[model samples]
Target: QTIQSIPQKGFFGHPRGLGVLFFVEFWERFSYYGMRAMLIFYMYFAIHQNGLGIDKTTAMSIMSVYGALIYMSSIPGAWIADRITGTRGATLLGAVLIIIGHICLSLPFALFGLFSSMFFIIIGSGLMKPNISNIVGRLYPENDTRIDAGFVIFYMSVNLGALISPIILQHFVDIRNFHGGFLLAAIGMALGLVWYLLFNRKNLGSVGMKPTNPLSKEEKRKYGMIIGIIVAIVIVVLLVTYYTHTLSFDLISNTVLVLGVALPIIYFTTMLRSKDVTDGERSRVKAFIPLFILGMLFWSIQEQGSNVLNIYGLERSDMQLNLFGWTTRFGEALFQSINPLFILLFAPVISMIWLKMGKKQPSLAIKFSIGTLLAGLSYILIGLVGLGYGHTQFSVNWVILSYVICVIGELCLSPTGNSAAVKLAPKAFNAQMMSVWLLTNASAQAINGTLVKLIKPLGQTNYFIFLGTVAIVITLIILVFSPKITK
Candidate 1:
């Protein structure tokens, strides 16, 4: 079939597909983040308060590992999109699965329900996350001048969903319960599905109707055998652990850490050593290594927004908001909105600076270094706050300031790395490039699953100060090697 082009402009002179695609992420983020806002509390809060009565440390570790798993699943999802379902089908199926996951979360099956929900959402997001942006790029002809503008709107609009969901859903959780919050998440994704069903065919046309790189039978058999062995290993291990009564959250986290660290090295080696990659292509791939490690360091600080920082707001902050004669407990879940809000506040200004600089803009390496530097300073701010406040409840304003700073660093670091991954990928390995970038987040979160446990041992002031110091060290290295990196 001929790939259909939308000559008609909708939504700020971009194609109608932008209108359709933007909402997919908006609603998905609404569902995902809304549920996440309350998930930690739901686990650690007492059973009398309608929570599962799990310990705080385990709950926090679960959240970070769950995030890592979602990113890890994207690797398989990428293959499915390219070789089996195509992006359109993969996205639609992912949405349906996410809806099921959220529905499971809304029910009262306890740990069973929570695990089922995580399993589904992790796999579904794996499929949906990578494809939405890929499809967005298809809407433009190569190097269309409006490309940046189109992406600007997509990113800007997407943050609205993340920002709003926490506010609305957390309020519901305050009044009704955590399950109510998750119900809203399911509803958000359900709405995304309805919009997709109605507009997808006409707006998207043949953009993702077929696989860009079709698979061969022999390769299929080889991949199928590999997947089967991996699944069999997981099943056998789980059975043995169950029988021995040794199944534990720490065990799960450790396993994820091993895979998270190993997969990237394996993937990088495969790309570099492949017969298909020329010497110059291998050189560019090697150039990506330093940036990739720095990316992991950057995300290590940034992703803690939902984990450690979230716990900080929940445990140590004064959340009471008194307006007029009335008052309400502002709560930690609502604080989840801060990062998205900061992105909304700072992204446009950052983009304008980049646009103004044009060819004179700093190299991608410099952006990573500055981004990592600023990200570390945000933790430095938190460390200072911890020192001043001691164990007493601190002002919410400090939490707000720390998150806002991280978003500015995000504006510098994230887009540059994502854009470079696609541009620098070897031609033969183009299909897998995005997964390599996605793993940066996965690896960080995976390591964090264990790192969070150190909080009790290191104490708050030292923990954050230590994290801040590590980033500063990495940023300095990034600065020194930056020119060679760009070459």
Candidate 2:
């Protein structure tokens, strides 16, 4: 079949079909952020208090591990899209799985429901997340100047979804209505799927229709049989472990943590030593390592918006707001939206400033250093709030300010790290290298799973101080080698 091509002249002087991709991504982010905002509180709150009644520490650990696996799973997801299903097929399959996950979450099945939902969402997200961006990239020819602007438009779509979802979802959650929020997420996914099915053929055309690396029939049968056997073995092993009561959360957390760290180590070492890599590529790969570490550190703190900071907002922040003669209280989930809100407001200004700076703009390493330093200072702000307010309830604006500061840190590091990953990767291992780059987030959240333990022992003030100091130390380390890395 001849592949249909999306008309290139429709969207903002680029492909008109980008609108479909944009809305698909927007709804995906909406579902994701909505669930995230509520998941932690749902885990930690007592059964009588309308939560699962899990220990706070365990809840944090679970949340961190959950996030880690989502990123890690993307590797296999991408492979399946490239090898078996084309990107479009994988994306549709993933969207279906995610909708099913949301359905599970919206049900009243307790821990069974929670874990099952997570399982579906993780696999589904893996399939859809990378391919959507792949389609967006494929929209334009190489060196088309409109490509960057198109991406900027796409990125704004992401933030719009993220910024709006939490505020909307939080309205549906109260003492005993967590499932209502999950239902909203499910509806969002359903809408996303419908949008894709209705408009994608017309808009996306033949982009992502062919797999980049198609598996032969024999190869497909071989991998399929192997996967089936592995699944059977895993089921048996899990049953045995469960029956014997030998399955432990710590074991699960530690195994994922180890894999999260080891995967990148293996990828980096292989890339550096590969015969296919030129010396220039090797040098670029070397530069990516420290930036990778910096990204990991920054995300460890930034991602804590759901775990540590969520708890802080619930426990410490004054919830009441005086607005136009009405007294209203804010929910903890709304706080999750603050970072995206800041990003939406400030990103354009930041882009303008960077463009104006042009050649004088800070080097990536320097930007990373500043990012980490600011992340540290944001935590220190929390520590200082504790110091001044004696750990009592304070205005929510303080937490909002903290988010503002961290979002600034994010603008400096996150996008730059993503750009650097693609630039530095050896062509032969491009996709794998991108997966390794994503491992930065997986590794960060894995580390956070362990680090959250400090909160219970050290208390919020000391914990914040410790994290703040560690970020500062990492910043200094990066600063020391910044010149060497850039060259």
Candidate 3:
């Protein structure tokens, strides 16, 4: 059978590329996060092993900028995707950029290499991250209830990739420390790009076509070039400004942090100025903002896997998991998989819970606020564990617990917010709203990155207390104002 003659849709009768994009996204995340697993500890590697021996807090702060900017860029990425390239082209562009970004990350350029690598990664992820699911949306014709199931399949691809990242990446880290694992991340991304391009070229042709009618390749190309140049200039200025000022990584992290936090506000402001949107649409858009902020706080605390929690794991946990009499001191990075694991396990139950909630109904805004409190409380569990354990190296189980609690919190807000953004956004701004959802993650990372620095100065107990307390503050604010939002 010739390739084009073969039916492009379904294995058991579903789209074939759904699985492909799922795994591609999965592997891409695996690659990116595998490096992230190494990022904090890499910053602290022993000089004998080529690390700077910098404190974990400082290292995490630098990581924050990389993590945060990566998400923040999605704002523009989604906008460009919607108005210009459509999701199909956007996904392709994103994947290509990530492959380049990861390869650059693997190159041995030292400081310049790291900076350059991050530059590509931030840009690449911005482009690619928003489009993965769009592949699933493309695969299915609209109103096909199978769309949800397809997304689930695609999400599993993410978990499948995430499941491997820490294990494989950290196995290398265990053998050769950070560089071993770090270099492997680039390899994962390369594999993902090959998979995506090889499979999706034909399938994705139709995904973005319906989102905007009468596709114009020339217009897309022109807009892409113009906007790309402007964004490049802005990024260069921002990058250079920090590079020259001798500004602390925390400052850089925080500045990006605010931008991430500000995205929905910016989105709303853009809407107000749009002269195209109506007050009803604007109100609904506003309704989602509180939910978005609430979601952001949940992410800020929950997203600490690569930052403070990993630091805590390395310095504080007991990771000796005995297997076959060969006692393997579990790598700190291994703990990174716990959330994906639980997400897999709990997704069904969590889905039911939301269904139940949707029926009896706490507003999405209230649930989001509550979820933030839960996420904050998740870290409080870690804080309590750390107090009881007090920086003494112990079993990897402690790290596992932290991930589990965060995942519980994640089930409450993360999944819910994801669904709401798609359902609630006025049809006109659907793509941009999803982008806004992504930036919440970026904003959280930006905030977490800068805050991770404070841990060393504050002491572990105090730090955990602070994280929990701040979560409560946000939670309370959201709880108080949430009614105003949904109404």
Candidate 4:
């Protein structure tokens, strides 16, 4: 299969199928970047303008859940690919369902359609997003020279998609045609699906046709019962929430928040409780748990940028600059670029320091603690800004600094944590401990889903301080204990 069985001449000289899969992912991100950008406004805007007219606080909570649910369901998606569907079937089905979900949002089904779309998009993305890229991994022949270049180009699809969707879809918003944007998102996915169907069997060729671990009768029987139990609970919860007339957003997002936190407890307990760990390594397992929680604390701040910070930029922060006496205004776009720019600028210098200090560099747990400290400090800056400028439109510089420090915190934890999670895995032989790496974001957003409910009651200044102080308090505690953790 080396040196040209498949067509290497295809798709800018890589291979036949890379372009096909690349094309699919392009639109998945295409739809999502634009969809989520405007979704909060769609929920919060007045109904007379044809928006959902949900309360502002609940609207922010739902935005966090949109991402939270996607990651949580991703766990099961990989599981489904391993069991019943295999990658090819799962990818196809996921794309179809995503298209369907977007279509639902494009129409006038009101509350019923909203939830229906949410359910579909969550499950659909869970299945499709992971597998599609995996197929690219499958496509390359082993040790192929072209893979790095190919992957770089493939990864570019998401960024390109992210950049363009907002530009294109924002026009729909200008026209007050929100549904029109949704329909366009639907069409993007459909176009990708059309290309995929045309070339899949011919190019992919036995790559993901069969599941790596097929379902057996015992698992089949067990999961069937598990599904039944889930069905029962879902029915009861719907009845309870709807009949009692509590807001559905609170009920559903609350459940995911609990699940988000609880799932880590499950990950750790099973890892330590089961077979195959040194008594010494098991202590590392115990140590890693505390450190993992620190990252989630950091996550709560970084993840809030799009929703909480963007909202602040719009309402509170004066989005402006005067150059040569003229003025210009910017919006969420300014808040969005700050993190990425700082991240790119800072990562090399930070990593260089670590490189130079290789012999004496602090362990990842300590570095991670420092990340939280920086995160706490940044939050406190914003909180103090809110305290000082509570009733005024102050400078955007304060917000930019807060965002800047947050990115530096990310440099400490984000790059190294990928390796840290693996080394701390105690027994990485398979998937159980691997899932722990992703828990940082998934769990943090879940916690955020719960925390955002307090914005109305806590007042913005106090809420920022609450995030700052809790993180600061924990980081100080962890710094003392970290030597033992990494020992």
Q: What TM-score would each prediction reach against the true structure?
A: 0.93, 0.95, 0.85, 0.88
lDDT of each: 0.86, 0.85, 0.72, 0.80
User: What TM-score does candidate 2 get on C-alpha atoms?
Assistant: 0.95
**Candidate 3 lDDT score at position 126:** 75
Q: Which stretches of candidate 1 lie over 4 Å from their true place?
A: 1-7, 218-220, 320-329
- Measured by TM-score, the strongest candidate is 2
Q: Which residue window of length 10 is worst by lDDT in model 1?
A: 1-10
Poorest 10 consecutive residues by lDDT, candidate 4: 1-10
Query: What are the per-model C-alpha RMSD values against the true structure?
Result: 2.5, 2.2, 4.1, 3.3
Model 4, span 1-487: residue lDDT tens = 3234355658888888888878888888888777776677677778887789888788888888878888888789988897888888999999999889998889999778788888899999889977886678778878778875677678667766766776677667656677988899888888889988998877777778778888899989999999889999998979887877875677788789889989999988887886787787678778878778898898888888767877776678886744466666654544655665565456668868987987899887888888899999998998898899878897776787788889888889887776766676675434666577777888998988888878889988898899899999988888888767875
Rank by TM-score, highest first.
2, 1, 4, 3
List the candidate 2 regions with Cα displacement exceeding 4 Å: 1-4, 225-230, 321-328
Q: What pairs collide in candidate 1?
A: none
Q: Worst lDDT window (10 residues) for model 3?
A: 1-10
Better by TM-score, candidate 4 or 1: 1
lDDT, residue 48, model 4:
85
